[PDB]
């Protein structure tokens, strides 16, 4: 789902075994966190075009998810991949997608 | 930009030198293709949550309406990263998003 997914996956080529792969996971935490915080705006080999946002300290969810929402340390990230990924989604889970 | 970004940046810890990362680039082509195509629905260790949006629509009625009719190889990958990436976006994009 997460560590199983890409520590296994990418170890197939790079990350060959436990030591290389384990670096990779702890190294993508470092790939972005530098970017998102200051350098957020990015494109990553047709795999990750990062474009995030805040919305400051409004703090006041609603009248339901008790005094909350995710608003005081920014808001989230909005990202677009494609090209490679794009051609992929074409034909394999897709006939359930247009009907 | 694409190659220079990943190869150097992520090589700092994992991807030691050209051999290591270089596998990781040609392999990220092989990381998604499987998923995006059929398994598109996915989360990437709190980095990349994939979810496709198929949209071409065109079977092939005849050389007339425009060879098409109904549903086709359709897609552009839509992705939302997670609280870890935007946890970093609580700093500097956090700020000037404001206006």
Swiss-Prot record, chains A, B:
This is Transcription factor 1. Transmembrane segments: none annotated. Selectively binds to and inhibits the transcription of hydroxymethyluracil-(hmUra)-containing DNA, such as SP01 DNA, by RNA polymerase in vitro. Residues 52-77, 90-99 are annotated as: May be involved in preference for HM-URA DNA. SUPFAM superfamilies: IHF-like DNA-binding proteins. Homodimer. It comes from Bacillus phage SP01 (Bacteriophage SP01). It holds the Pfam family Bac_DNA_binding. GO terms for molecular function: DNA binding; structural constituent of chromatin. Belongs to the bacterial histone-like protein family. Keywords: DNA-binding, Repressor, Transcription, Transcription regulation. InterPro entries: Hist_DNA-bd, Histone-like_DNA-bd_CS, IHF-like_DNA-bd_dom_sf. Residues 61, 93-94 bind DNA. It comes from the Viruses.
């Amino acid at each position: 789902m997460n560590k199983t997914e890409l520590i296994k996956a990418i170890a197939q080529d790079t990350e060959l075994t436990q030591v290389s792969v384990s670096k990779m996971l702890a190294s993508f935490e470092k790939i972005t966190t530098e970017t998102v915080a200051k350098g957020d705006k990015v494109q990553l080999t047709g795999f990750l075009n990062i474009k995030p946002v805040a919305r400051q300290a409004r703090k006041g969810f609603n009248p339901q998810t008790q005094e909350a929402l995710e608003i005081a340390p920014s808001v989230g990230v909005s990202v677009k991949p494609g090209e490679s990924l794009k051609k992929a989604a074409e034909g394999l889970k897709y006939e359930d997608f247009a009907k």
